[model samples]
Target: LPALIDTQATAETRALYRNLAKLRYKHLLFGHEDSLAYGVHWEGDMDRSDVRDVTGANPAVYGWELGGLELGHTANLDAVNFEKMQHWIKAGYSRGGVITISWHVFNPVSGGNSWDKTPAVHELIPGGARHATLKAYLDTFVAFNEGLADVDAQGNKHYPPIIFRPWHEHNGDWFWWGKGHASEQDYIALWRFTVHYLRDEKKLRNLIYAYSPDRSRIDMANFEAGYLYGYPGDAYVDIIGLDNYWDVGHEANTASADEQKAALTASLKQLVQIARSKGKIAALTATGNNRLTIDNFWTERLLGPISADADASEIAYVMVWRNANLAREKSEQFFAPFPGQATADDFKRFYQSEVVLFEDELPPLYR
Candidate 1:
């Protein structure tokens, strides 16, 4: 199913959009996060710290953060500055890799973090007092998108289209836009207004919107609950993403590992069906047992469930979180394998599979 190319989008952006839909079900792209402005694997020596160095293959998708762009500094959780973000946007597109952006935007009303749910949802709507603040945030977001363009020698500007996923995991209660904090109608209004402002007023055509919900549980009923409660409309979304994490010991004691795999397989199939019904693409946007604690997690836990059935493997891509060299944290915060890690061998095997498409294997999507 090909995506409806936004009439206002650039030719290059439209090409990428079409290619994504065409590639669906045929191959699953791999993605990882190295979003820090400096000192990270992807930003630094690609041969030393990146996924390519560890698995002998580069991910087809690159995940980045726009967490603190509105504040004009790299003070956000991911600490990615505008300059570094510009570099990454161009680098990924030049290499035919997909770029996806997530925002941990601050609360407009409380002036706190994204989690500060001080009735801030009301203030961000049309008639609300803090509506202007929301506009300011959108303004910053627009400016950043505008800066993503690269001018050719002939002076023609080319802007790379990105998967812009805002207010992600809305089904969870941790963020202000989550279920308990904002009503369905309120969330819909906010999302619609944001898209309209960016596309119509700000004239940003490089954005492809994605709606994602955190995995509540590995059951069809839990996956369906509040999954599309705040969906603005099919027209406003280009992709449907599902973010799930492996629970270390949270699964039912009675359920065997094979049963748990069946549960995840069912959930993924349902998500793909929903996306196809709406004529949109589906992706496993985020996954990985936190810290890569389990030894055979890559082969048995993560890949086994997602690739169990043909329908389950139809998702466009799957992105694991970053691998931070954090000595201060209580536990090692690594998602992808790093050199001699226990899961490194299995990660190599996962990458060697013909069904997985990495950066080197990607076609000339933008060309």
Candidate 2:
């Protein structure tokens, strides 16, 4: 009836999907390649049909693209099926899967697209009033959320637009908006402006903001400082999310197994502590690179510490970056444990353990 509350497709890939669904993993987020959605890369294209097909199977959270507001003005979101989005929510997928529409806009010249000049066309702020394109952007988001806002929309309350992670990983310099790309004050102000515009002008209470930083370089003064820069208080943020992928190469080369575990655990522990102080939940969101090896590595090092930590009470969800709908169709690197690398039983054992799934031993602070 409800597609089994587990994935029901019967292909070989379905087996992988079923294992993931059975893992007590309440949410799933798909990572479509950047090229297809936005012209960021030129290697591949996102097959919309493939995306629909994959999402149809799991009915979990699916990611869409909001290419850099670089070349094109702004696109209307209504062209996509909002009704179908509602069905995904009703079926059990939630909104922890939104990609940002705006890219970096540096002030004082950071060698990136500057939003200050592109106001009307860029749609950088909340209300379309400031920027025609930004207004369209906000309108699309509002319209999408409104579509899913059906009370009794699901067996549960509406899906509440639960995870909006914008300008994530400000600590990294790869993005034009990274701490190195723009002044810390400008970056922080942009974050503040987006939130205020959305909350006050758009009145989109259905959204829950997620503040995520990259794990590999947490202590990088610029990165950490950027996340904390112009941070609004508890009123603005709902989740403190981190994007950490297992550094398999590092594990193999420099750090001992135990050392790697300790380092990752400490990072997560610190993140949980900070999140609690601000009255927010913690999420380990979005990861890639070496998916198969990394998932197992993460299972061993990260989950236990999170569950056992005194501050884990504030940790709400840990969503894996399962890139099911790839344009070129590479191996299932991020979704499944590497074949032969991890057995069904191996993963099942990790999933079955409550300490792993629910992280029961985690202290009351996370509750």
Candidate 3:
């Protein structure tokens, strides 16, 4: 009923995971990245959030990146500390929130950033020189994943369950594991090998794997076929993750709202259907119109397309990108709106929609 890859997992409580699949029928969870960490004008300010500052509560789903941890970095690529990440993760679980993590580590081949194109998947797979480096990276992730735990008054340790999205967006050329650098065969091998090592070899159970790809690069003409560009197989994946930016409101998209909504609903319609056939759950794991430039983006562009088509709206959750505070990083780039922002009121209305579930509106997910 959970749409999990297999019933072989035992290290996690079904009470926490079993309901997420069925709950999609009721409402889609709203997620925010860098949630509980820092926001548009705040840092280490645990009591507030950009999303929460606009609406009444934090997002129902929390997304975090674990990129640099593989390299034994104290902080991730975004400069968020691995140690501090655990606090946010732990706080998320306490609030009955769903946690999802993405990997954007530097290219192992060229020792470059995630965007650096230096053919590396080939070198990171089995029978390759960097394969050991790959193992060390994965081992680091395992430790970070496993170390997130709590001890009760009785001293029993409990680890939280989170979705682990590794090598995401591999259908695109931006990441090293994706097109132009990684062969289909090599990518498949990398995924299979990674799963085998973590799920079986490492004996990890609390980690649920989600396979994500950017929708802009995938073939929408033949949705299912194109969406599975580098699919490793059902055995290794649990969530059908899609990172859509083109349809929502990428700067490159000058299309009308009607056109954008049609494209988005169409893709999501097929996405849910495919996930159903695979016994997996579908999610808009990443999406957002950078900057609050569009006044009605939240309700019109996002929630409109989603709620328009019932079946297309069956996503487990939709996660928007980060809001790098100008004061903190001097970034003009942002996904969600903050108080006094142009789209702030529109965001509030969107949050009020019965179908959009925030943390305050969340029903006992962990129980």
Candidate 4:
């Protein structure tokens, strides 16, 4: 399926996004958060401590957070600084890996964190009082993105293509922009206004907007009600993504492991069908159970279900959450495998699969 390219996107970025849609089911990129910044088992030393260190392969997609960009510090969810983010973004692009970012900006109307749902959605709309505040936040975001561009000796400019995922998991009511807090029309307006403000007004040609919703329900009716209710339309989104987590040992449900796999497989198939119909790319944007405690999670649980069926394997990429240092947290909450973790060997084996594509294995996606 050919995608509708954003007119504001640079020629190179458009080409790359089209190439990603073409790859579709043929290859799947592997990604991890803060892969180069820090790890659950290692930190500080850049060369020896990353997803590459354990699996012997760099991730095809490098994920980062912009949670604190609006505040001008690393005090937000990911605690990543601007300098470190720029370094990794340049390094990822130089290494032929995809760079994707997610934002958890503070609430513009309430002046609280992203989780604060204080009836502020209406105030951030076009004619609302807090609209200027929203614009200010977006302006800062645009400045940060503009700084990521690179120029050659001949004066030719090249901006690294990025998957910009903002206001993610909005179907859930936990965040201020979620379904319960904001009316459907208001949410849609907010998304459309933001996209137009950034792409058309700010002229950020390096971005490919992604709209992701939490996968709390697998049925199409419920999924459409929450996940697709505020969909801004095909032109506003370049990627259709889902953020789901595994519940090992049926802790959350009575379903068996096989049943759980079947449910996930069905959900992926549905998402792929929706993407195919809209001529958009589909991806597993955020996934991973707490600590990756399941010994064979990479094989029998996560990868196994996705690879079991042809339609399910059509996702472009699957990104695991970050692996924070154990010292930073009270609990053992790590996503990717560490040196002696139970799923470390399993992860290595998952990387060897032919369907997966790491950094060295990626084709010329930008060129």
Candidate 5:
């Protein structure tokens, strides 16, 4: 399983990204800024849009975005730092390939005026931005694919495309689209509507749909708790991913390493069972600190053990979270450090052995 290094593109970061790509962990997720909609001021000043295109810097990245807001305007699209992206993609790397695209909205289901009040969201609608409507936003979403579908400078269409994960963590009620935010019918309707609009209206058939819920929603009861919110018909989803993080010191007062591993393994097992029943692929898509330990249990006790024993047959992908901010936190973080838990070289060895793929070798799930 390859780790999804979720971070920005700084000079230092680029080195890590290039190194990771060489080692076979090619999927890199950037723009947490876009994910949370932080620092984005959608003033209809598309020409002056402040969002940076981090993916342009990494040849290894299949570019990804949190939502269409940042890219909703022509001006913003024009600003897409293609010079940087071209450097890599033009050098025999893939062009505009995407590993994932997610809509991690603060409030997706809430229709109220207060829906936009979340800390991470900047309601462009309230500010009279014409592109703020959901439909308009989706238009931009589809446009991205249309843009990517073209032949590159070298005349090849980018392949091994992106998967869209919308309204993730359905089991958690805090987000606008979470189960607690609206009736199940409304939530499901949103999912269906978004997919239809994207497919029918926009014609973005290249995308793979991924339904992701947090780890806490794994058990039948918990899974149902979110499923009760909504399950788009089979046509809309191709994969099920779980966003589970090992909280390092907080597993349980009495929980041990083996116990924690079992708990996570159980979630994977349950997701596979349920997803198979629904005829979908399963993945542990997003993971963090829970994978590493500062003490004696780094690689030998954590990463190596989990990779060796986890049910790899049914798990299409296991993407470890790799954000430097996540690592700096003293108390809680998502992923373990490279070389620390397991050196980057050692981890690279593991990834090269498992996750690398040529465009044609992608799993059927990708199709």
Candidate 6:
């Protein structure tokens, strides 16, 4: 049940997988996207975080993105400096926190942003029209990853083993690699090829692959095809992940509050069952209320139902989205909370819950 997708994974990576599988029996690691890079009203603060501003502790996991990296850019799509991102990653690792990353690359075939969705999955495979472009993008990624190791005093480097989630939210029709953009066969081919290229060809050893798809409203029915639509199988994925913003506290959702929370609880049960069957771990890899409109969004809407349920409580970690803008508007885009955000006090309660884990609750995962 604790096997790694990359059989040749490093000792630190193996330690991460082993400990997390055991820890999830009692606790769920709380994670935040771009926690150190920026926040609701700040930018480029070295050791500052909105999560810490209210809770007085860092999250157990830090999330990052690599949108512009594929284009040889110095910063990500959000303009967060790549060099600073590397520094923050090492900093978080030094503090005994884990890191998880996702890629939102430009649609290579269309030369546009990720939302361009010009159906380029077929062109990214080996011997395909845009195969060279895909290779070039990954080459840049490999060069970036090579610097993620920390040099010890005794002249050795210790790489922070982390979860690498690529092509996430594939069941949704948003990104270029999602459903309707790429068929099941094409996605499977692309997933295997990417994993092989990174682990086998490029020789990366510190990554644990996670296969994440968005919540396609996985009720009692359509459970299998909804989740396993582009599933690369047991050998290709170490973690079964889901990114659900709809069931969280999205304003766009039309369902009742109780029904949405119930749906999330049921989905977690189904997700964890599949993970157990496949001898893999699972996580709510990405989720959060977009504006956090409700006061009890964190505790009641998000954490209460999950922690109350037996199967939902088995999720390893839940990494929420970023707090992007400097200020808030009704139409502003921010998934996490700051000091004065409506859900701030409830979030503090969420952090204070015994079932929720932060950086201080982490053990020597790398030792």
Error of 1 at 326 (Å): 0.9
The local distance difference test score of model 4 is 0.80
Query: Tens digits of per-residue lDDT for model 4 on 150-229?
Result: 88899988878889998888877888988789998998898999889988888778888888887864344565545687
- Positional deviation of residue 347's Cα in model 5 after best superposition, in angstroms: 2.5
Clashes found in each candidate (C-alpha, N, C closer than 3 A): 0, 10, 0, 0, 12, 0
Which segments of model 5 are wrong by more than 4 Å? Answer: 1-63, 67-98, 106-132, 152-160, 220-229, 246-254, 290-312, 325-346, 352-367
Per-residue error at 327 for model 1, in Å? 4.3
Off by over 4 Å in 6: 217-220, 327-331
Clash number for candidate 6: 0
- Per-residue CA lDDT of candidate 3, range 130-248, in tens? 89998998889878976687777999777777788889888888888888888999999999999999888897767788899888987778888788888999998988889998997
Q: Which stretches of candidate 3 lie over 4 Å from their true place?
A: 10-13, 152-156
> For model 1, how does the per-residue alpha-carbon lDDT over 87-160 read when each residue is reduced to its tens digit?
77677777788889888888766678888876677778888888998898878877787778778899988787
TM-score of each predicted structure versus truth: 0.91, 0.61, 0.96, 0.94, 0.61, 0.96
Clashing pairs for model 6 are none
The runs of at least 3 residues in candidate 1 whose Cα sits more than 4 Å from the true structure, single-residue gaps closed, are 35-49, 217-219, 222-225, 246-256, 327-331
Candidate 4 residues lying further than 4 Å off, grouped into runs, are 47-49, 74-76, 217-226, 246-251
Q: What lDDT is obtained when candidate 5 is compared to the true structure?
A: 0.44
What tens digits encode model 6's per-residue C-alpha lDDT throughout 115-174?
998999999977679898888888887888877876779997678887999998888888
lDDT of each: 0.74, 0.44, 0.84, 0.80, 0.44, 0.87
lDDT value, residue 222 of candidate 6? 78
In model 5, what lDDT does residue 130 have? 28
- TM-score, structure 6 vs. true: 0.96
Best by lDDT: 6
Which of the two, 4 or 5, has more TM-score?
4
lDDT of 2 by residue, 1-367 (tens): 0111112222222232233323322322233322122211122333322222322222123444333322232431212233443444433323223322223323222323433332222224333243454444455556555655455545643433345677776666655556565565665656776676767777654455667777665653344453465455555565677776643224334766676555555655666667656645555665434444544544464455555454542344555443442333544434333223443234444444444432222222100
Residue 85, model 4, lDDT = 75
Q: What RMSD, rounded to one decimal, does every model reach?
A: 2.7, 10.6, 1.6, 1.9, 10.6, 1.6
